[PDB]
Structure formats: C-alpha cells, structure tokens
Design an enzyme around this catalytic site. Structure first.
Site, PDB file in Angstrom:
ATOM      1  N   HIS A 189       0.832  -1.210   0.000  1.00  0.00           N
ATOM      2  CA  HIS A 189       0.000   0.000   0.000  1.00  0.00           C
ATOM      3  C   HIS A 189       0.871   1.267   0.000  1.00  0.00           C
ATOM      4  O   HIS A 189       0.362   2.364  -0.180  1.00  0.00           O
ATOM      5  CB  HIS A 189      -1.003   0.021   1.184  1.00  0.00           C
ATOM      6  CG  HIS A 189      -0.366   0.263   2.529  1.00  0.00           C
ATOM      7  ND1 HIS A 189      -0.060  -0.757   3.410  1.00  0.00           N
ATOM      8  CD2 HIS A 189       0.003   1.410   3.146  1.00  0.00           C
ATOM      9  CE1 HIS A 189       0.491  -0.247   4.498  1.00  0.00           C
ATOM     10  NE2 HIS A 189       0.536   1.066   4.365  1.00  0.00           N
ATOM     11  N   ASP A 194       0.456  -7.863   2.057  1.00  0.00           N
ATOM     12  CA  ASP A 194       0.828  -6.460   1.967  1.00  0.00           C
ATOM     13  C   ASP A 194       2.355  -6.330   1.910  1.00  0.00           C
ATOM     14  O   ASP A 194       3.008  -5.845   2.847  1.00  0.00           O
ATOM     15  CB  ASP A 194       0.257  -5.722   3.165  1.00  0.00           C
ATOM     16  CG  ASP A 194       0.292  -4.234   3.009  1.00  0.00           C
ATOM     17  OD1 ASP A 194       0.666  -3.742   1.913  1.00  0.00           O
ATOM     18  OD2 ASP A 194      -0.078  -3.557   3.996  1.00  0.00           O
ATOM     19  N   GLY A 239       2.981   6.825   8.577  1.00  0.00           N
ATOM     20  CA  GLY A 239       4.334   7.241   8.207  1.00  0.00           C
ATOM     21  C   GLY A 239       5.402   6.182   8.456  1.00  0.00           C
ATOM     22  O   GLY A 239       6.492   6.279   7.907  1.00  0.00           O
ATOM     23  N   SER A 247       4.547   2.854   7.839  1.00  0.00           N
ATOM     24  CA  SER A 247       4.215   1.762   6.899  1.00  0.00           C
ATOM     25  C   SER A 247       5.352   1.334   5.990  1.00  0.00           C
ATOM     26  O   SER A 247       6.079   2.170   5.499  1.00  0.00           O
ATOM     27  CB  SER A 247       3.047   2.131   6.022  1.00  0.00           C
ATOM     28  OG  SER A 247       1.818   1.758   6.615  1.00  0.00           O
ATOM     29  N   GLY A 248       5.481   0.019   5.787  1.00  0.00           N
ATOM     30  CA  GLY A 248       6.553  -0.570   4.994  1.00  0.00           C
ATOM     31  C   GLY A 248       7.867  -0.838   5.718  1.00  0.00           C
ATOM     32  O   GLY A 248       8.755  -1.507   5.188  1.00  0.00           O
TER      33      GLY A 248
END
Ligand SMILES: [Ca+2]
Lengths: 156, 223
Positions: free
Chosen positions: B40, B84, B175, B177-178
């Site tokens: 995402h 994800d 912020g 994420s990943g």
C-alpha cells in the site's frame, strides 16, 4: 495517485484538518434534515466562501498520507457541541454522522479531471453527489454519475 | 512510532525512507539492490533514501537512489491488506558500509513473545500528529495469534501478525508503513496497519515476512 491539498501538499492520513470545498455554495458542513434537533446530515454550506467544518481522513494503513487506492473513514474534527463524538460519516440515501463502532471504511477519494470526487463503496463504489442545487438542501448523497468535484483546503 | 525513542545514529542501517517529494513510508534493505516494503506504499515514482537519520537535514551518510522495479505481491488486496508486501529494485546498488547494511530474511517464523525492533519516521502521537526529523525506535514483543485475532475480529489472515502492547501507549503509526520489524537479526514484519495508534486492545498489525521468503527469492532471481 497521491491526493494533494490546494497548497500542493499531500493530504494527511489520520492527521490535520481540511475543508472539503467545491472545485470552482461553500465547503461541506452539517445541516438538520429529519435528524431531530442537531444537524447530523452532511451538507455544503450555502454561502460562497472557501469554508466549512474541518474534516480528517483516515485509513487503517500506516502510510503518512492519502492515496486514491486507500479505504477511508471521514469525520468532522470540529462540529456543534450537540453532535456525536466522533462525528464520523456514514450512510436518495444521505451521509450522516454517527458514533456506532462499524469498522467499515467505505469511502475513497478518486481523481476527477484535475481535482477529486468522493465515492462510497460496499470493490464496487458509487459517486457521492450534491442532492439539490439550491441554498439549504445541498446534501451530500449517493448519486452515480453526478459526482461533486472537490478540492481540499488545509486549515491553519 | 508512538512511545519509542530516538535511535542512535545509523544504528538501524537497513532502514530506508521511501520519498515521492517527502517521506511517506519506510522500507528494509535485504540486499545491495533490493528493498522490501508494504504494498500500500506503492507508487509509480519512488525515491529510496538510505543512510538517513535526520530526514530533513543532509548529514553526509545519505545515498539517494531512484526505485527502478516496483513490484507488489500479485495477490495483494488493498481493501483487506492481505499480502501487503512489495519489492523495490534500486536503479543502482547501494554502497554497503557501517551506516547502510542488509538485514537477513527469516530462517523461520518468530515465536509469541519474541522481542523485535521496530523503527520509522511516522507520527509519534496517539492523539494528534507529530512527524519527526529523527528516526524513532521501539522494542516490542510478538503477540499471540489469539490476542491478535481477538483485537481485530474478522480482519487477521494467516499473513498477519500483531506486535506490541494490548495496553497501548507503544505502537507504530502512520508514516511508519513498509518499515522493519527485526527480531533476532531477522526481518519478521513489515509495518502494515491498525485501529489509530497506541490504543488499548488495538495493537499494530504487520505483514508476516516468514510466509514470503520464497516469493522474495524468486522475484529477485527473475528480475
Ligand atoms: Ca539526512
């Protein structure tokens, strides 16, 4: 795509405050429509000014800002002292505000020509549009094919 | 990262910032040309910034390298956030040194209670918003499958794990994420999602990296 505010900056996810303004009536807020005493129905303010009730957009995904692929909740961050808390959006079938837990995230923002529109999804989505084109009944409702074109002005 | 601490400079040398004009997501360097992130966090244009500690100040250990290949898992679902995970191939190999280094893929899934390190430049507040210049760190335990699924009925697939505190406080946030969850020198998680940040009974949910080792190895080899 990344969703930008009117200053060109990316719209924040679960943070900050924006007026939802017409891309050219004023910005979205609330008005009373068979809601009892409080304005509980999302409406565009009648008067031609870049103002409304501030809104915050929220995906459970932990990206810093809003993209057109995200699933959103939307709430008014400020509203009349009588309104529910949070003043969260939920569903001519109109958009009203509510507390109920309902863990859905049924809204997205999509590109609309040079600006954006809001959609409601069950991923099959429908356009959210302006019910009546007047002063006091410009309620945000479901309206396939007649989307309300919006931009996002960040509040200071 | 809510409830965390400012990491010592370049102490997480595998952490990257994904930048499309500003920071928006984190990533993890798993070899000299490939980064792993959340799907995402996908964009058509990403710049990867390695060697960073203060993301708003040029301090001298930075390497800025454009994303070349940007591949989301074929079965990613954007509504449920199942699978994800994403791979980025850098357009040139990073120069490996003490400040820019690789993190090992997992040699198995992590047990409930295993301690991980989680890091990013996400929001540091659970009410309101605050975005830090300096990389934030959080030490947090992997939570039982039972606690995780209890917190989010209907929303936890076998490709998700929860990490953090049922009591809230301490959590990752928007912020982040990943970014990495690293437990015993392995990458076991990718920052993915939650209800809010740092709320009671709403722990962080993370992509379960141990499920994808083969997908990753194969994607690398084919590209
Ligand atoms: Ca820097």
């Amino acid at each position: 795509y990344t969703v930008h505010d009117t200053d060109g900056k990316p719209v924040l996810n679960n943070a900050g405050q924006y007026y939802i303004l017409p891309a050219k009536g004023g910005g979205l807020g609330l008005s009373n429509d068979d809601d009892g005493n409080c304005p509980l129905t999302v409406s565009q303010t009648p008067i031609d000014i870049p103002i409304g009730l501030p809104v915050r957009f929220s995906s459970r995904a932990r990206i810093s800002h809003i993209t057109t692929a995200l699933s959103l909740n939307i709430e008014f961050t400020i509203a009349p002292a009588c309104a529910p808390k949070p003043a969260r959006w939920r569903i001519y079938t109109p958009v009203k505000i509510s507390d109920d837990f309902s863990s859905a995230a049924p809204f997205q923002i999509k590109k609309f020509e040079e600006d954006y529109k809001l959609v409601y999804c069950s991923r099959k989505c429908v356009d959210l549009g302006i019910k009546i084109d007047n002063e006091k009944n410009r309620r945000l409702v479901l309206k396939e094919g007649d989307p309300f074109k919006v931009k996002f002005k960040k509040v200071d | 990262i809510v409830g965390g601490y400012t990491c010592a400079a370049n102490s997480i040398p595998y952490q990257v910032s994904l930048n499309s004009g500003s920071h928006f997501c984190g990533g993890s360097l798993i070899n000299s040309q490939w980064v792993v992130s959340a799907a995402h966090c996908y964009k058509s244009r990403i710049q990867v910034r390695l060697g960073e500690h203060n993301i708003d100040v040029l301090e001298g250990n930075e390497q800025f390298i454009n994303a070349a290949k940007i591949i989301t898992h074929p079965n990613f679902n954007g509504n449920t956030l199942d699978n994800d995970i994403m791979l980025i191939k850098l357009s040139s190999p990073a120069t490996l040194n003490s400040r820019v280094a690789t993190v090992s893929l997992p040699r198995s899934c992590a047990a409930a209670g295993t301690e991980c390190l989680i890091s990013g430049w996400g929001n540091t507040k659970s009410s309101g918003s605050s975005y830090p210049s300096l990389l934030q760190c959080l030490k947090a335990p992997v939570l039982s499958d039972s606690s995780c699924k209890s917190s989010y009925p209907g929303q936890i697939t076998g490709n998700m794990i929860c990490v953090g505190f049922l009591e809230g406080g301490k959590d990752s946030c928007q912020g982040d994420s990943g970014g990495p969850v690293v437990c015993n020198g392995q990458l076991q998680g990718i920052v993915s999602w939650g209800y809010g940040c740092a709320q009671k009974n709403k722990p962080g949910v993370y992509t379960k990296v141990c499920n994808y080792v083969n997908w990753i190895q194969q994607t690398i080899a084919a590209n």
